[PDB]
């Protein structure tokens, strides 16, 4: 009956005519000599001035090697200063950045490059072997940041290019700048088109305003142990950090012992994490061997946070305020943010994932009738605002079933909003499986299984797991006289997919339960 929810914070001014790099580096002059990017693994450091200049050099270098405005560049790198420099340089060039986990298989990397139409791939030499075959076969340029195996280019060709040769580019706020992949509410992984305006809006919703929803001040140091090739770290850590002028302490590889030492050494104050990471930190027996007094904020997002883990963290890190952030790639990605993180904080309740961001609208709809619901009534969470995606790359039908005719993005998540405007996520409508914060699309694994000569049908479902949250398991229908075993099938999948998409168990059945239409009755399967 038309119930629209909004933030408890007032709307603020958000630019509608600026390129992403111009916006996040807008107040550069106020802290140009300050550390911007710090590699916690090797000590490398770039000041804000260094970053701004290098981004322009990268843009000049990209043009020099034939990369044009509108072209897609694919990063195959771990979180690092290099990733950020490449991203900002591409933005300055009017180019687009798509990225994949460097631990992806050769099959995944090629499929990603082909689907995104990447014209350049940037990675590390230790991962080059996985792109070699594809490289010298698709005419795509390959570049490495360390050594330059074969005839690949070197990243210095970009970082050390002449900034005076940076091409003059006219960038529209509606131009796409990032292309993260996501399976959305159903189906296979798709390219999510995020624009300059969309990302700017999402960043502003989090850190701008007299009373920012996510308050980061001058003395803060933000930890980046999450992957920049995914939206959480890209937006809430990288872009938000740059916008507020805070130094970003990057950890290319998560290691408890090292992290604790880095927190003391660099006085890390903000720790954006995911449940799996939080649990590892909590189980650490060395918390007393380091001074972690600088930590003042721990933000969990990307997956459900159980009460027990929430209680454990509050008990082990009493010097910090614990809270959640709720986001979805297609949403820009932040939908709601803990108001206890605001400059002038609001009270919050345990288990809540935050309050809908300002400069946006949220509604909860009955999954079957589409009707809007009032407070305390669970339904599908929908959001509308300039921060959402433009749409899915080359996939109009997927876009049409995700963003409705009135501009509302449908999340596939079930939740409700209480009397204090705090949002609670209680279930999931969509088939998405989440392993340690990573997306595991059942349809993707299903397609791979069915491609097997001895498999006629299959269905993949998520199995509850204390350590990863959910682990994928498969129900398989073998061909008539197949002698294939559980382990043989698992090995078949393990060789083609990234480590976290491996199927934990294979159950053989006679048929996959489907609706009269043909849709897989996943509810039935999960029910064993
Ligand atoms: N706080 C949460 N609690 C429960 N479930 C969540 C939460 N956060 C995200 N999810 C689930 O994860 C799905 C989206 O998966 P995607 O890989 O596209 O984005 C993952 C990143 C989400 C994020 C980004 C920026 C932030 O500041 C905080 C979180 C949501 O639809 C939910 O199903």
Provide the CATH number for the domain around residue 441: 3.30.300.30
**Is the beta carbon of 63 within 6 A of some atom in ligand 1?**
no
**Is the beta carbon of 435 within 6 A of some atom in ligand 1?**
no
Q: Cα dihedral angle (141, 142, 148, 151), rounded to 10 degrees?
A: -40
Contact 192, 182 (CB under 8 A): yes
Q: How far is the CA of 441 from the centre of ligand 1 (A)?
A: 15
Q: Name the domain boundary from 396, 429, 462.
A: 429
The minimum-distance atom of ligand 1 relative to the CA of 206 is 27
In angstroms, how far is CA 481 from the centroid of its own chain? 43
| Residue whose CB lies within 8 A of the most ligand 1 atoms, among 303, 313, 325, 441, for a mutation test | 303
Extract the tokens encoding 382: 């929908």
Beta bridge partners of 387: none
The minimum-distance atom of ligand 1 relative to the CA of 337 is 27
Q: Single out the residue of 33, 25, 14 nearest to residue 89, CA to CA.
A: 25
Beta bridge partners of 222: 248, 270
**Is the beta carbon of 387 within 6 A of some atom in ligand 1?**
no
Same domain? 134 vs 15? yes
First to last CA, the chain: 38
3-state SS, residue 440: strand
Same domain? 445 vs 417? no
Q: Name the domain boundary from 429, 462, 493.
A: 429
Q: Whose CA is nearest to atom 23 of ligand 1?
A: 327
Contact 249, 268 (CB under 8 A): yes
Same domain? 462 vs 352? no
Task: Please give the radius of gyration of the chain, using alpha carbons only, rounded to the nearest integer.
Answer: 23
**Is the beta carbon of 236 within 6 A of some atom in ligand 1?**
yes
Contact 390, 198 (CB under 8 A): yes
Same domain? 223 vs 337? yes
- Phi then psi for residue 352, to 5 deg, are -80, 150
Q: How far is the CA of 481 from the centre of ligand 1 (A)?
A: 43
Same domain? 166 vs 297? yes
Extract the tokens encoding 117: 């139409």
Q: What is the DSSP letter of 382?
A: E
Handedness of CA 265, 266, 269, 272 (dihedral sign): negative
3-state SS, residue 346: coil
Strand 334-337, strand 297-301: pairing = unpaired
Residue by residue, DSSP assigns 493-521 as HHTTS-GGG--SEEEE-S---B-TTS-B-
For residue 227, CA distances in Å to 230, 291, 396 come to 6, 25, 28
Q: How far is the CA of 513 from the centre of ligand 1 (A)?
A: 29
Q: Using the structure block, give the residue that is written with the tokens 């916690």.
A: 40
Residue by residue, DSSP assigns 79-130 as SSHHHHHHHHHHHHHT-EEEE--TT--HHHHHHHHHHHTEEEEEE-GGGTHH
Side-chain-facing half-sphere of 327: CA atoms under 13 Å: 32
Q: Single out the residue of 425, 419, 327, 428 nearest to residue 374, CA to CA.
A: 419
**Is the beta carbon of 303 within 6 A of some atom in ligand 1?**
yes
Q: How far is the CA of 231 from the centre of ligand 1 (A)?
A: 9
The minimum-distance atom of ligand 1 relative to the CA of 235 is 25
Q: What are the respective helix, strand and coil percentages of the chain, to the nearest 5? A: 30, 25, 45
Q: What is the DSSP letter of 211?
A: S
Same domain? 444 vs 476? yes
| Residue whose CB lies within 8 A of the most ligand 1 atoms, among 187, 301, 353, 423, for a mutation test | 301
Q: Whose CA is nearest to atom 15 of ligand 1?
A: 328
Strand 455-465, strand 469-478: pairing = antiparallel
Same domain? 219 vs 93? yes
**Is the beta carbon of 80 within 6 A of some atom in ligand 1?**
no
For residue 114, CA distances in Å to 51, 110, 117, 179, 442 come to 30, 6, 5, 13, 21
**Is the beta carbon of 102 within 6 A of some atom in ligand 1?**
no
Q: Whose CA is nearest to atom 8 of ligand 1?
A: 302
Extract the tokens encoding 87: 């991203």
Contact 30, 245 (CB under 8 A): yes
The minimum-distance atom of ligand 1 relative to the CA of 412 is 31
How far apart (Å, rounded) are the C-alpha atoms in residues 338 and 336? 7
Q: Produce one character per residue of 336-362: b if its CB has 16 or more CB atoms within 10 Å, e if not.
A: bbbbbbbeeebebeeebbbbbbbbbeb
How far apart (Å, rounded) are the C-alpha atoms in residues 483 and 245? 60
How far apart (Å, rounded) are the C-alpha atoms in residues 64 and 19? 21
Q: Which residues are part of a known binding site?
A: 230, 325, 327, 329, 413, 430, 434, 439
- Phi then psi for residue 348, to 5 deg, are -135, 165
Q: How far is the CA of 300 from the centre of ligand 1 (A)?
A: 10
**Is the beta carbon of 127 within 6 A of some atom in ligand 1?**
no
Q: Single out the residue of 214, 241, 211 nearest to residue 226, CA to CA.
A: 241
Q: How far is the CA of 302 from the centre of ligand 1 (A)?
A: 3
Same domain? 131 vs 102? yes
CATH of the domain at 215: 3.40.50.12780
Side-chain-facing half-sphere of 385: CA atoms under 13 Å: 32
In angstroms, how far is CA 508 from the centroid of its own chain? 34
Handedness of CA 335, 189, 298, 178 (dihedral sign): negative
Contact 419, 376 (CB under 8 A): yes
How far apart (Å, rounded) are the C-alpha atoms in residues 202 and 330? 11
Question: Angle CA(272)–CA(382)–CA(6) in degrees, nearest 5?
Answer: 75
Q: Single out the residue of 51, 103, 96 nearest to residue 253, CA to CA.
A: 103
PDB resolution in Å: 1.9
Q: Name the domain boundary from 382, 400, 429.
A: 429
Same domain? 144 vs 198? yes
Q: Whose CA is nearest to atom 20 of ligand 1?
A: 302
Extract the tokens encoding 269: 């104050």
Residue count of the chain, please give it.
528
Q: How far is the CA of 113 from the centre of ligand 1 (A)?
A: 25
How far apart (Å, rounded) are the C-alpha atoms in residues 6 and 11? 9
* Region of residue 148 (left: phi > 0; alpha: psi -120 to 50; beta: else): beta
Q: Whose CA is nearest to atom 31 of ligand 1?
A: 328
Contact 206, 336 (CB under 8 A): no
Range of the domain at 313: 1-429
Same domain? 435 vs 412? no
Same domain? 383 vs 523? no
**Is the beta carbon of 352 within 6 A of some atom in ligand 1?**
no
**Is the beta carbon of 327 within 6 A of some atom in ligand 1?**
yes
- Please count the structural domains in the chain: 2
The minimum-distance atom of ligand 1 relative to the CA of 430 is 33
Same domain? 299 vs 343? yes
Q: Which residues are part of a known binding site for AMP?
A: 230, 325, 327, 329, 413, 430, 434, 439
How far apart (Å, rounded) are the C-alpha atoms in residues 207 and 297? 14
Residue by residue, DSSP assigns 277-320 as HHHHHHT-S-GGGS--TT--EEEEESS---HHHHHHHHHH-TTS
The minimum-distance atom of ligand 1 relative to the CA of 353 is 1
How far apart (Å, rounded) are the C-alpha atoms in residues 41 and 57? 25
List the determination method. X-ray
Q: Single out the residue of 511, 358, 247 nearest to residue 12, CA to CA.
A: 358
Q: Single out the residue of 328, 321, 342, 352 nearest to residue 419, CA to CA.
A: 352
């Amino acid at each position: 009956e038309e119930f629209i929810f909004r933030s408890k914070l007032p709307d603020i001014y958000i630019p509608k005519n600026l390129p992403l790099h111009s916006y996040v580096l807008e107040n550069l002059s106020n802290h140009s000599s300050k550390p911007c990017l710090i590699n916690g693994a090797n000590g490398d450091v770039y000041t804000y001035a260094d970053v701004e200049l290098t981004a322009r050099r990268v843009a000049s270098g990209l043009n020099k090697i034939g990369i044009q405005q509108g072209d897609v560049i694919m990063l195959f790198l771990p979180s690092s200063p290099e990733f950020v420099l490449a991203f900002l340089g591409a933005s300055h060039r009017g180019a687009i950045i798509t990225a994949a986990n460097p631990f992806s298989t050769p099959a995944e990397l090629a499929k990603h490059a082909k689907a995104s139409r990447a014209k350049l791939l940037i990675t590390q030499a230790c991962y080059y072997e996985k792109v070699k075959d594809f490289a010298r076969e698709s005419d795509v340029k390959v570049m490495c940041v360390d050594s330059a195996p074969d005839g690949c280019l070197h990243f210095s060709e970009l970082t050390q290019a002449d900034e005076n040769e940076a091409p003059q580019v006219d960038i529209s706020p509606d131009d796409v700048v990032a292309l993260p992949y996501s399976s959305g509410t159903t189906g296979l992984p798709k390219g999510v088109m995020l624009t300059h305006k969309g990302l700017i809006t999402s960043v502003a919703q989090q850190v701008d305003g007299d009373n920012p929803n996510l308050y980061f001040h001058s003395e803060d140091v933000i930890l980046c142990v999450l992957p920049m090739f995914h939206i959480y770290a890209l937006n809430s850590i990288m872009l938000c950090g740059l916008r507020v002028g805070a130094p970003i302490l990057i950890m290319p590889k998560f290691e408890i012992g090292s992290l604790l030492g880095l927190i003391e050494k660099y006085k890390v104050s903000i720790a954006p994490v995911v449940p799996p990471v939080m649990m590892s930190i909590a189980k650490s027996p060395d918390l007393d061997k380091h001074d972690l007094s600088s930590l003042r904020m721990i933000k969990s997002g990307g997956a459900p946070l159980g009460k027990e883990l929430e209680d454990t963290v509050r008990a082990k890190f009493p010097q910090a305020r614990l809270g959640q952030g709720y986001g979805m790639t297609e949403a820009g990605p932040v939908l709601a943010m803990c108001l206890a993180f605001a400059k002038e904080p609001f009270d919050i309740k345990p288990g809540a994932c935050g309050t809908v961001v300002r400069n946006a609208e949220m509604k909860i709809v009955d999954p079957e009738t589409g009707a809007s619901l009032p407070r305390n009534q669970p339904g599908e969470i929908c959001i509308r605002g300039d921060q959402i995606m433009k749409g899915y790359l080359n996939d109009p039908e997927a876009t049409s079933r995700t963003i409705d005719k009135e501009g509302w993005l449908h999340t596939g998540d079930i939740g409700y909003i209480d009397d204090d405007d705090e949002l609670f996520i209680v279930d999931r409508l969509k088939e998405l499986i989440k392993y340690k914060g990573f997306q595991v699309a059942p349809a993707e694994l299903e397609a791979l299984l069915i491609a097997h000569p001895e498999i006629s049908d299959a269905a993949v479902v998520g199995l509850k797991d204390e350590d990863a949250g959910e682990v994928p398991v498969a129900f398989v229908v073998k061909s008539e006289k197949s002698q294939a075993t559980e382990d043989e099938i698992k090995q078949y999948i393990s060789k083609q997919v990234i480590f976290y998409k491996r199927i934990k168990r294979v159950f053989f059945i006679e048929a996959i339960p489907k609706a009269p239409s043909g849709k897989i009755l996943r509810k039935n399967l999960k029910e064993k």
